[PDB]
């Protein structure tokens, strides 16, 4: 009885346009419906910036979060799922995506190393708050976690700003 | 205060950067002092994973931190500057660099978006401790020639010692 959306493959490819061809890590994303959640699968067959370390690096946790978060937002804007984004169209999203979606704060905590080859993740929008000072942006709080098929596990938080809204 | 500052060790730096891809070498200079601390300059002429967003991204803060941190450890090993690492040689460092130097926790706070084309940073090792691996608490910050400001902390684990 909770509404869910399977991976919207067309939207996903378009969300991932700004990322390089060899950097498309987000493979699937089921979005559950006013503060939405994404449940995702990831794969990094080789790193984009460094020789193989043997584990999912902090850097990659962050790249993957960005992908998952952009997808969650885009899909939420498309299906009207996210409180605070009622006025947005998908066109607004493509315009804002790169210059106007900012990370104010990022944290990652590794409990145990994760396998970068195949891993799962999830995130939640915990609050979205609009600000329009006399003379203008959304403030958002999110949490995520990652795990794999063995015992890998990482969790964290990110505070976002959506400016020029 | 008094201890001598080590200018950028260019040969060590280039070697520390070998595992990074050719377009992802952002750390351009790094002065090391005991207090161990590194004071660094960085340049990202273009991003390695995404089209230009116009500001230094959280991802890049993290890449640059890793480069700075690896160089500070390597240089500290070479020069005997970090307690906990007294027994290490550079050859130990090269063996551990990728598989055995882990981030346990990373945080960044972006006060003011930073210019990715030219910016500065610093970090410090606050504590190193054996635990039943080596556990290190570190803090860093970045700034630029305008009003850019990012800061954070990273907890590291050095394993298989
Ligand atoms: C020391 C770091 C660990 C990590 O980022 O999680 N690996 C090297 C790199 O990812 O740049
Ligand atoms: C939403 C982020 C902002 C950032 O990482 O700081 N830009 C997209 C990216 O860097 O993947």
Q: Which of A42, A24, A45, A62 is nearest to A119 (CA)?
A: A42
Q: How far apart are CA B60 and CA B50, in angstroms?
A: 11
Could you tell me the resolution of this structure in angstroms?
A: 2.0
Cβ A103 vs Cβ A126: under 8 Å: no
Q: Is B104 in the pocket of ligand 1 (CB under 6 A)?
A: no
B129, B84 in Cβ contact below 8 A?
yes
Give the distance (Å) from ligand 1 centre to CA of residue B133: 17
B3, B85, B86: which is closest to B37 by C-alpha?
B3
Q: Which residues make Cβ contacts (< 8 Å) with residue A160, sequence separation at least 6?
A: A69, A101, A102, A103, A104, A138, A139, A140, A141, A142
Task: Among B42, B65, B66, B108, name the best residue to mutate to test ligand 1's pocket (greatest count of ligand atoms within 8 A of Cβ).
Answer: B66
Token couple for B23: 């377009």
Residues contacting residue B100 through CB under 8 Å, at least 6 positions apart: B158, B159, B160
Q: How far apart are CA B79 and CA B86, in angstroms?
A: 10
Q: Tell me the C-alpha distance between B93 and B70, whole Å.
A: 9
Neighbours of B120 (CB within 10 A): 16
Report how far ligand 1's centroid is from the alpha carbon of B124 (Å). 17
Do the beta carbons of residue B90 and residue B77 sit within 8 Å? yes
Closest Cβ–Cβ partner in A51, A63, A113 for B98 = A51
Angle formed by the axes of helices B10-17 and B58-79, nearest 10°: 130
What's the N-to-C CA distance of chain B in angstroms?
31
Q: State which residues form the domain around B103.
A: 1-161
**Could you say which of A23, A57, A105 has the minimum Cβ distance to residue B108?**
A105
**Domains identified in chain B, total number:** 1
A148 and A120 in contact (C-beta within 8 Å)?
yes
């Amino acid at each position: 009885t909770t509404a869910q959306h399977p991976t919207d493959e067309d939207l996903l490819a378009r969300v991932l346009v700004p990322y390089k061809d060899h950097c498309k890590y987000l493979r699937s994303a089921v979005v559950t419906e006013g503060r939405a959640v994404a449940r995702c699968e990831f794969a990094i067959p080789e790193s984009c910036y460094i020789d193989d370390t043997g584990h999912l690096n902090s850097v990659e946790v962050n790249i993957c979060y960005n992908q998952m978060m952009y997808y969650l937002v885009a899909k939420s804007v498309k299906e009207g799922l996210l409180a605070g984004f009622e006025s947005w169209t998908l066109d607004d999203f493509w315009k804002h995506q790169l210059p106007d979606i900012l990370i104010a704060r990022f944290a990652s905590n590794f409990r145990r190393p994760v396998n970068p080859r195949a891993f799962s993740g999830e995130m939640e929008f915990q609050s979205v708050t609009r600000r329009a000072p006399a003379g203008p942006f959304l403030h958002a709080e999110t949490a995520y976690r990652y795990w794999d098929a063995d015992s890998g596990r990482c969790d964290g938080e990110a505070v976002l700003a959506f400016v020029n809204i």
